[PDB]
Write a protein that binds this DNA or RNA. Sequence first.
RNA 1: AGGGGAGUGAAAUAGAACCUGAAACCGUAUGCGUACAAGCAGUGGGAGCCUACUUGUUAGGUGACUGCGUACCUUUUGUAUAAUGGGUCAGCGACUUAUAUUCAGUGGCAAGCUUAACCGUAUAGGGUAGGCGUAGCGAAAGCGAGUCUUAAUAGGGCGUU
RNA 2: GGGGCUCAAACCACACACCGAAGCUGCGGGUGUCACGGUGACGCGGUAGAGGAGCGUUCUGUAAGCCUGUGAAGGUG
Lengths: 48, 142, 117
Amino acid sequence: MQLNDLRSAPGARREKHRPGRGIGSGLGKTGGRGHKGLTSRSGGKVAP
Amino acid sequence: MKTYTAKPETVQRDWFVVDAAGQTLGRLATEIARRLRGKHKPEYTPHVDTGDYIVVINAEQVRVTGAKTTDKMYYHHSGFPGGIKSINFEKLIAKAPERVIETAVKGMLPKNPLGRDMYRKLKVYKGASHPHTAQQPQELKI
Amino acid sequence: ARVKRGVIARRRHKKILKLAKGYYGARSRVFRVAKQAVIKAGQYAYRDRRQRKRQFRALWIARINAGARQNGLSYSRLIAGLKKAAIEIDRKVLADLAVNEKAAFTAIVEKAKASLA
RNA sequence: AGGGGAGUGAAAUAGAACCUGAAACCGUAUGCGUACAAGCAGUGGGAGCCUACUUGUUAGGUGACUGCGUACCUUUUGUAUAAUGGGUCAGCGACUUAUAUUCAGUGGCAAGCUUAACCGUAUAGGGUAGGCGUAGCGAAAGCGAGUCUUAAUAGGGCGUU
RNA sequence: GGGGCUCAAACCACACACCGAAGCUGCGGGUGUCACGGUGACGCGGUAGAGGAGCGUUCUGUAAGCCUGUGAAGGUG
Ligand SMILES: [Mg+2]
Ligand SMILES: [Mg+2]
Ligand SMILES: [Mg+2]
Ligand SMILES: [Mg+2]
Ligand SMILES: [Mg+2]
Ligand SMILES: [Mg+2]
Ligand SMILES: [Mg+2]
Ligand SMILES: [Mg+2]
Ligand SMILES: [Mg+2]
Ligand SMILES: [Mg+2]
Ligand SMILES: [Mg+2]
Ligand SMILES: [Mg+2]
Ligand SMILES: [Mg+2]
Ligand SMILES: [Mg+2]
Ligand SMILES: [Mg+2]
Ligand SMILES: [Mg+2]
Ligand SMILES: [Mg+2]
Ligand SMILES: [Mg+2]
Ligand SMILES: [Mg+2]
Ligand SMILES: [Mg+2]
Ligand SMILES: [Mg+2]
Ligand SMILES: [Mg+2]
Ligand SMILES: [Mg+2]
Ligand SMILES: [Mg+2]
Ligand SMILES: [Mg+2]
Ligand SMILES: [Mg+2]
Ligand SMILES: [Mg+2]
Ligand SMILES: [Mg+2]
Ligand SMILES: [Mg+2]
Ligand SMILES: [Mg+2]
Ligand SMILES: [Mg+2]
Ligand SMILES: [Mg+2]
Ligand SMILES: [Mg+2]
Ligand SMILES: [Mg+2]
Ligand SMILES: [Mg+2]
Ligand SMILES: [Mg+2]
Ligand SMILES: [Mg+2]
Ligand SMILES: [Mg+2]
Ligand SMILES: [Mg+2]
Ligand SMILES: [Mg+2]
Ligand SMILES: [Mg+2]
Ligand SMILES: [Mg+2]
Ligand SMILES: [Mg+2]
Ligand SMILES: [Mg+2]
Ligand SMILES: [Mg+2]
Ligand SMILES: [Mg+2]
Ligand SMILES: [Mg+2]
Ligand SMILES: [Mg+2]
Ligand SMILES: [Mg+2]
Ligand SMILES: [Mg+2]
Ligand SMILES: [Mg+2]
Ligand SMILES: [Mg+2]
Ligand SMILES: [Mg+2]
Ligand SMILES: [Mg+2]
C-alpha cells in the first residue's frame, strides 16, 4: 500500500473527449456539430 | 529465384531480309514490327531492345486491297495556319515508295525513346538489292 | 501548467522530411510540400503491390508464348494441353525454363502436344 | 575595416552583435545522372557506374530505359478544375470556467441518506435549520391504499403487492 | 483511340481454347462478435454521426529516492 500503487476501480473514471484534435480522434474539424446552421455556432442554442 | 531480365550489353541480334513483292501492306507490317520489338524471343523484356534487324528490298511493289490505291490518304500539318497537306497511296508510291512501309510500321511501335530505337533497325529500300551485304541477312518468308 | 510545442513539433516535421529524401525541389525541403508528397507516395505504393503481381504474370505469359511457338504451338493451345495431361507447373517456373533450361521446356511442350492439344 | 600568427583561459567554432545555435534561404568540395526529349515529378520493374567491407543471394549513393499515375484544403448533386485559401520557415493561435440540474459508470450508508452558513484542538470533530425518500388522488376543502368524476359501493381516469 | 483491315482484323450462325478484377481459391499473419472450455463459426469499404481503447507534452505526489562533469537537458546522424 504505497502512494504509487493505488488506483480506482475500472470504469470509475473516464478521460473526457476533446473536439478539434486531428482526424484519428473521431471528433476533429467540426467537433460533432455537423455543417452550417444555427446549432453549429458559438452560442447557437435553441430556446426551451 | 527472381525473374530473368535481359541486359542491353549482352543481347544477340540477327539480320533478316524481307521482300515485299505482292504482300498486303498492313499484314506485312505487323510481322515486321513484331520482330523489331523482340516478341519472338523468350528473352524479351519490356524495357530493353531485344529485336532483330530487318531489310526490306522491293518497297514499291507492296499492295493494298479494295479501292485503297486512290482512296487512302496521308495527312500532315506544317504548323502554319491552313497548313494541312495530303497525298494518296498511288502518288506517294511514285514519289517516296519507302515512306509507305515506314509509316505503317512506325504506327505499330511504342511512342517513346525505346520505340524510336527499334525503328532505327529497319532498313527499307526500293530496288532488289541492299547495301548491307557484309551483314549477311538471312531470308525471311513473310 | 503551460505547455510549449517547440520540441514535439520539430520532431514530427523531421520524420516527414526524412521520408521525402531524394525528391525534387521543394518536395524534399519544405514541410507543406513534402507532407503531400509522402502521402501520395504511400498511395502509389499500396496500389502498386497489386500491379506488381499483374505485371509479372503478363511477362511470364509473353515469354511462354515466344518459347512455345519455337516448338510449333501457341500459348493458348499449350495451356489446354498441359491441363489435359497432368502438369501443374507455374507460369513463373515455365518462363524460367523457357530462357534458362531450353531442353526441359521442349520436353514439356512435346508432352503437352502429345495430349492432342 | 578585416584578418594570419602569438598569448589568456578547462574550453576562443566561449572574442565582446560573445551560452546552446534548429529551419527557411545562400554557397564550396566529391560521387553518379543529364544537350532527339513532352505533362502533379512520385511509385512497380530495372541495366550500368562509384564507395565500404564480410569480395558478392551484402550494405550505401545515383537512376539510363520502361508499366501505371491530372496537388492539398474548403464547399457542394457534383471539382485536375479555368471555384475558395495558402510565397516559405520558426514561434503563437480556437469546445473553457462558475453555479444549478438530468442520465450512465463506480463507491459509502441504507427505511433512511445527507448537511449549509457557522464554531473548531481546523482537510478531524461538531452543527441535521434545511433538502430528498418512506402515499396517492383531487382545482381545492378534504379523504386516504385509495381517491376523483357522478344521483350511482355502476362504469371509467390516476394510484396501490 | 491510332496503325492498319476486304474468301477480314466487317457482319450472321455454330464450336472449342485462352486472356482478363482489390471477385473466388491456395499459403502466412492481425482483429470484432457469439458458442464451448485455447478452440469453432462468419464478419472486418465508408462521409455526417454514435460507441470502445490508447500514445505523447508540461506541472504535483511517490522523491531528503534514483541518474548525472567518467558528462544532464537540448541539437545533429
Ligand atoms: Mg466520423
Ligand atoms: Mg453531436
Ligand atoms: Mg465549415
Ligand atoms: Mg446545408
Ligand atoms: Mg444541423
Ligand atoms: Mg459570439
Ligand atoms: Mg505554447
Ligand atoms: Mg533522386
Ligand atoms: Mg495483367
Ligand atoms: Mg494478370
Ligand atoms: Mg593555452
Ligand atoms: Mg562549438
Ligand atoms: Mg562555448
Ligand atoms: Mg553556463
Ligand atoms: Mg554562439
Ligand atoms: Mg541551418
Ligand atoms: Mg551550385
Ligand atoms: Mg542522350
Ligand atoms: Mg528525331
Ligand atoms: Mg517539358
Ligand atoms: Mg506523346
Ligand atoms: Mg526495384
Ligand atoms: Mg544499390
Ligand atoms: Mg523508376
Ligand atoms: Mg517512371
Ligand atoms: Mg496521367
Ligand atoms: Mg500515362
Ligand atoms: Mg480553403
Ligand atoms: Mg458553388
Ligand atoms: Mg454549384
Ligand atoms: Mg442541382
Ligand atoms: Mg474527377
Ligand atoms: Mg488545382
Ligand atoms: Mg491552371
Ligand atoms: Mg472567382
Ligand atoms: Mg484553383
Ligand atoms: Mg463562394
Ligand atoms: Mg491566393
Ligand atoms: Mg500566446
Ligand atoms: Mg447511477
Ligand atoms: Mg448506491
Ligand atoms: Mg377506480
Ligand atoms: Mg390502474
Ligand atoms: Mg491505346
Ligand atoms: Mg470464314
Ligand atoms: Mg475462360
Ligand atoms: Mg489477381
Ligand atoms: Mg476478398
Ligand atoms: Mg489464411
Ligand atoms: Mg469487405
Ligand atoms: Mg470499417
Ligand atoms: Mg514530479
Ligand atoms: Mg561527450
Ligand atoms: Mg523540461
